[PDB]
Every structure is written in C-alpha cells, then in structure tokens.
Design a protein around this ligand. Structure first.
Ligand code: RBF
Length: 184
C-alpha cells in the first residue's frame, strides 16, 4: 500500500471511450515516468490502476473495474491527475495509509483559501457507503489527511495551502467530483 502523499501530477493526453471501459493516456513528469513500467500498479487520483503501455512520456491505463466508483468516466483531456508510486524500500504507515480501493465519488460543496490553508468541504452522497469518522484520515484523490469536522453530510478537510500546488486539490471548485477512500 501507499502513503497518500502525491508525488506529481499527470495530464490526461488521450481518452478512448469504450463504453464500460476507457483507456486513458496520461503525460507523466520525468521523475515519475522513469520509475514506472508496464504492469506497475500505482495510484492515479488515489485509485489503484495498472500500467498497460508506455510510449515516450505517455503512460496508459485501462479503467474497467474502477469505472463505476471513480471520476475517470467523466474526466477530460487536459485534466490533471495525482500520481503516487508505491514506496521503494518500505514504510510505516500508521496511518492515513491508502489502499487504492476508492469507495466512491463525492462532490466539493465549497472551497475557501485563507490563512495559508486550503479549506475543502466535500458532500458525501447517501450511498457512500460506510464510516466516516472525524478522528480518522480520509483519502481525497489520493491525498491522505485528517478530517477536521463533519457537519450533516459534509466533511471539512483543512489542508496546508501548498498542497494546492503539488496536487490537483488546487483545481477543485464547487461541484468538482473527487475519489474518496475511507480509512476504513
Ligand atoms: C493490483 C490492483 C490493480 C488494479 N488495476 C486496475 C486497473 O488497471 N483498472 C481498473 O479499472 N481497476 C483496477 N483496480 C481496481 C480499482 O483499484 C478499484 O476497482 C477501484 O479502486 C474501486 O473504486 C486494481 C486493483 C488492484 C488491487
């Protein structure tokens, strides 16, 4: 499993629509690109996916098993995805560790940037699914962080603002769909 610390951003270059599957070609930054190969299983927006092909800096994935419980179906060419390759020589996670099994999609209710914090409010739909506890960490697009507060069906996560920079958290707006991994 994975730390839930995003190591870089990919940009979707190509999408093949195959109805109950899609193939996404993602441009990878050079440091992550050279750390992966065919058959690498890594997190893309917090979801475990297997590399099917690499051509130049474009890394390809098929989304099939994951197509009904993640955002991939509705993403577009040019969108930015979070990337995380498994730890090289191990880790103690303990433990916002992520497994890569996304529980389902949720939707950004509100964002506020203040006081060096990115405050994200995420509305949890009723049929997701189990948990969610304010003492626990949660994965949002592969970023693992403690929950700040839960009010009704809205979870408030108060991120340091520089994760606005190093992950796609800073592309989120009201109505953005996200992959949630509850923990657990
Ligand atoms: C080893 C492993 C590899 C996986 N590879 C894929 C993949 O390439 N495509 C896919 O749609 N789901 C894949 N999944 C399943 C996916 O992570 C899971 O359906 C979603 O997280 C559910 O929301 C994989 C899961 C595991 C454990």
């Amino acid at each position: 499993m994975f730390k839930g610390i995003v190591q870089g951003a990919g940009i979707i270059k190509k999408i093949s629509k195959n109805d109950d599957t899609q193939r996404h070609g993602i441009t990878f930054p050079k440091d992550i690109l050279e750390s992966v190969e065919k058959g690498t299983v890594m997190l893309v927006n917090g979801c475990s996916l297997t590399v099917v092909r690499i051509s130049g800096d474009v890394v390809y994935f098929d989304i099939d098993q994951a197509i009904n419980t993640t955002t991939f179906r509705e993403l577009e060419v040019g969108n930015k995805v979070n990337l995380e390759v498994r730890p090289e020589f191990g880790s103690l996670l303990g433990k916002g560790a992520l497994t890569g099994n996304i529980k389902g999609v949720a939707t950004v209710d509100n964002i506020t940037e203040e006081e060096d914090r990115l405050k994200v409010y995420i509305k949890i739909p009723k049929d997701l699914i189990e948990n969610i506890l304010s003492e626990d960490h949660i994965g949002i697009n592969g970023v693992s962080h403690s929950i700040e507060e839960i009010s009704d069906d809205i979870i408030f996560i108060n991120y340091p603002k520089n994760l606005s920079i190093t992950t796609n958290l800073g592309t989120l707006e009201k109505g953005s769909d996200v992959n949630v991994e509850t923990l657990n």
